Amino acid sequence: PRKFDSTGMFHWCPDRPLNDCLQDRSQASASGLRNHVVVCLFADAASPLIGLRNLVMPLRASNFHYHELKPTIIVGNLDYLHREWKTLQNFPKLSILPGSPLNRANLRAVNINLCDMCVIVSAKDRNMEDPNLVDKEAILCSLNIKAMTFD
Amino acid sequence: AGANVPLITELANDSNVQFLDQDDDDDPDTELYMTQPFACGTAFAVSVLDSLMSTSYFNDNALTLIRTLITGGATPELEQILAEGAGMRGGYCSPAVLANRDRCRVAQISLFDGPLAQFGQGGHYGELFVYALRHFGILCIGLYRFRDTNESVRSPSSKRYVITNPPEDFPLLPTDQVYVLTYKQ
Numbered sequence: 001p002r003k004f005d006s007t008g009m010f011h012w013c014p015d016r017p018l019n020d021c022l023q024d025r026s027q028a029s030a031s032g033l034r035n036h037v038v039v040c041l042f043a044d045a046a047s048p049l050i051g052l053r054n055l056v057m058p059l060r061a062s063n064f065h066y067h068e069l070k071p072t073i074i075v076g077n078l079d080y081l082h083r084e085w086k087t088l089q090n091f092p093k094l095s096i097l098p099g100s101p102l103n104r105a106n107l108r109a110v111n112i113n114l115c116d117m118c119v120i121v122s123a124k125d126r127n128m129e130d131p132n133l134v135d136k137e138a139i140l141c142s143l144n145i146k147a148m149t150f151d
Numbered sequence: 152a153g154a155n156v157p158l159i160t161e162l163a164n165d166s167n168v169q170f171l172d173q174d175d176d177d178d179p180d181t182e183l184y185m186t187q188p189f190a191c192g193t194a195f196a197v198s199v200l201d202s203l204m205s206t207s208y209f210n211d212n213a214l215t216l217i218r219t220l221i222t223g224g225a226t227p228e229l230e231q232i233l234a235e236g237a238g239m240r241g242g243y244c245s246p247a248v249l250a251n252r253d254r255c256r257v258a259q260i261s262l263f264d265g266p267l268a269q270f271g272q273g274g275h276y277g278e279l280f281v282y283a284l285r286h287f288g289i290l291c292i293g294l295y296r297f298r299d300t301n302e303s304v305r306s307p308s309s310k311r312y313v314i315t316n317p318p319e320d321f322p323l324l325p326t327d328q329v330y331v332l333t334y335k336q
């Protein structure tokens with residue numbers, strides 16, 4: 001009863017619209033995400049595509065049982081995720097939380113004290129600024145997450 | 152009452168302050184203060200904040216005094232609350248946290264009328280200060296006084312300039328206003 005990709009290498013689900021998995025903070029907190037993978041994606045509405053598929057594709061290998069799948073959830077810009085959903089729609093257990101990942105309310109919603117890993121990817125256009133200021137957002141997010149407190 | 156409208160223009164470039172008033176007749180090379188607009192509170196330049204980088208170094212407690220005087224208190228816990236991204240939130244708060252509800256605000260009082268009107272009748276500033284502090288817990292910071300005595304002949308305008316903590320024996324015109332650090336309304 002598990003739908004796999006034609007090659008049999010990856011888990012698969014029928015194509016669904018973005019809102020089929022789009023969630024707000026209330027819905028994200030309602031879902032008891034545990035041992036999942038949070039992806040703090042710093043992207044603009046027109047920032048170049050980075051292919052989040054290549055991040056979720058290895059996460060959905062067929063050698064993992066369906067219950068062994070880590071529920072990946074992406075916290076980032078919503079238009080960029082609209083652009084990425086064309087490729088991201090076929091992976092099960094995926095979820096989307098719009099808004100900036102620097103917002104502490106999001107990280108409270110998608111339980112980040114309980115997540116198995118918190119990727120921090122920046123899709124913004126950089127290296128046109130000072131090289132030391134290129135990763136300002138990623139370092140700020142890392143420090144913000146490391147400075148949080150939970151119960 | 153076109154010219155009686157109280158307005159505070161904020162200036163990005165301080166050198167433009169000369170254009171705020173025409174009767175000032177001040178030299179263009181004058182600094183930001185000593186100019187009639189800034190000295191009257193009508194103008195305000197962002198450049199002042201740059202000078203706040205200096206004092207906050209020389210006086211450690213300058214910035215925390217400024218913020219308490221200015222921002223309504225802005226308790227650090229409040230920007231911790233705003234740091235959670237949920238925005239400003241709260242409901243019918245308990246009286247325990249309402250204990251700080253009655254703190255010291257800054258306001259203006261008029262010597263034209265009220266319990267302090269007698270000090271405007273040729274009284275001295277120190278008398279008003281001591282009386283207000285002893286009777287109402289009111290701390291008179293300074294004066295807001297007409298640029299020229301409002302007799303419609305000396306100056307028919309409602310223009311006022313600020314005097315920060317005038318001396319003990321400063322005479323008090325009846326039309327002068329007083330900046331106060333009033334407590335409990």
Ligand SMILES: [Ba+2]
Nearest residue numbers: 169172173175
């Ligand atoms: Ba002028």
